[PDB]
């Protein structure tokens, strides 16, 4: 027994063809089954034929005959159908409202999540459907990982470098940081974990969650996890207040946090508030300042990633009493300067998926472009707070959608929070970039921030662009442009100061070629989010939807504190780069 995801109408039926098995009310369960291929229906039992060696599972072909279900062929003389009168048979048959349409719920139940349209619906539908879609999507994602063949150690060529043998009759996953494996040592009668791992073409380069002497026979699978069902909505109901509520502001604050005093007061006068923090605008500074602004307030800092939580801790450690902080870790090496797993501590830093059930004066959820509606609902489920603050930048990168191919995902559709910020705008905006040369701030202010992002720094006059399509080659799941690395090699011979530069591209394979040929440190745009470097060399590599994503581009070029070279493929973004152009040698 449970609740109709469309009606909430109390019900005893769950669709058994739905990977999540949502409770559906007599009306909704029927409208679902007759309007899709979903025809298996589960109650306190499964509406299948209890006839010895029959295969009938279609509820539209089955009859209650006794207290046992039968198809046409096996039914007793006395039986009534399970599925008739616009209703499917179970408990609570007289309490059942239905819906005008069930069309949206069917799409969510039946979509393969390869089309942007699927994520658009999942974010424009009613809230209980946002939860259903988010479970359905996450479970589809976890199951899709199993589809991938096991990788086994055939040889150990060196340290840091391996030979892999791959399971026949199953695709192999892309070998980039988005795909995190778990290794396993072959044992007596079973297997035991041996840390997590990531791989990259050689043979294959492996960067593991610990060191070992891993030998032949050790194998790797993308560890999938159980997706629990969602209860809480993605956003609580907004409330606006006429005074600050439940928070006591400090009388004496430092001039370091003085620029956020207005914003901190906003945070005290609504239930939840959205803060858009462009690159190098002081999001963590803002997040920690709030503590000092509300000294007695219990604050739970959360983000999706251990990295994002650890950065909050690093900042905390520079301003908040250490004895008043705890880092929450479930039984990967993360921040270890606070007492560990102390939930009643005044400042609690903790990934979403590891959050305890607890209350707080404020909840700060950071790096919000990267949250899914799944993570959103989890926080509202785990954390009951007087105020919720959502800090991120919907102009930056979202969580990868491993299943998505047909369409690009716009920021309004990354999650409920980014939807709000891109539709009703953000409650709060950090409009001064302290990181980047002016030429890079002018460029992204125009590109994605409506000319509201202002440069602290002056022009560096070390921001350059080059239009060079060169030559694109493809390997199994990535792109290479050797002539764009050539141009950069030739640029470095003539500008050797630029050998302190970080190399950034949209493709881990470009990065690997570049690392060999140039010896610069490499980052994918996606791995670079949240890091800064004085000098950045950027090869677009291709003009794909991927390599022209305006959010990826925004992140690529705002990594530079001083200078950047952008070797561009796309004539559109080359022309939006407010940078000194350079000719081709
Ligand atoms: N869609 C939807 C949906 C709306 C409300 C609830 C009631 N509920 C349960 N847990 C909650 C936490 C915070 C706030 C409300 C909450 C459940 C699902
Ligand atoms: Zn179904
Ligand atoms: Zn219903
Ligand atoms: Zn039968």
Curated annotation (Swiss-Prot):
**In residue terms, where are the LRR repeats?**
223-243
Chain positions recorded as Zn(2+) 13 binding sites: 49, 54, 71, 74
Name the consequence of residue 333 to D: In strain: Gamma/P.1
- Record-listed a ribonucleoside 5'-triphosphate binding positions: 277-284
Q: Which part of the chain is the (+)RNA virus helicase ATP-binding domain?
A: 252-430
Superkingdom of the source? Answer: Viruses
Compartments annotated for it: namely:
Host endoplasmic reticulum-Golgi intermediate compartment
List the catalytic activities from the record.
Answer: ATP + H2O = ADP + phosphate + H(+)
Q: What is the effect of changing residue 35 to P?
A: In strain: Omicron/BQ.1.1, Omicron/XBB.1.5, Omicron/EG.5.1
Give every CV ZBD domain span: 1-112
Q: Which residues form the (+)RNA virus helicase C-terminal domain?
A: 431-585
Which residues does the record give as Zn(2+) 11 binding sites?
A: 4, 7, 25, 28
User: For Zn(2+) 12, which residues are the binding ones?
Assistant: 15, 18, 32, 38
- Oligomeric state and partners? Interacts with nsp8 to form the replication-transcription complex (RTC): nsp12, nsp7, two subunits of nsp8, and up to two subunits of nsp13. Interacts with host TBK1; this interaction inhibits TBK1 phosphorylation and decreases by 75% IRF3 phosphorylation, which leads to reduced IFN-beta production.
Sum up the protein's function in the record's words. Plays a role in viral RNA synthesis. Multi-functional protein with a zinc-binding domain in N-terminus displaying RNA and DNA duplex-unwinding activities with 5' to 3' polarity. Activity of helicase is dependent on magnesium. Binds to host TBK1 and inhibits TBK1 phosphorylation; the interaction with TBK1 decreases IRF3 phosphorylation, which leads to reduced IFN-beta production.
What's the protein called, per UniProt? Helicase nsp13
Q: What is the lineage of its organism?
A: Viruses, Riboviria, Orthornavirae, Pisuviricota, Pisoniviricetes
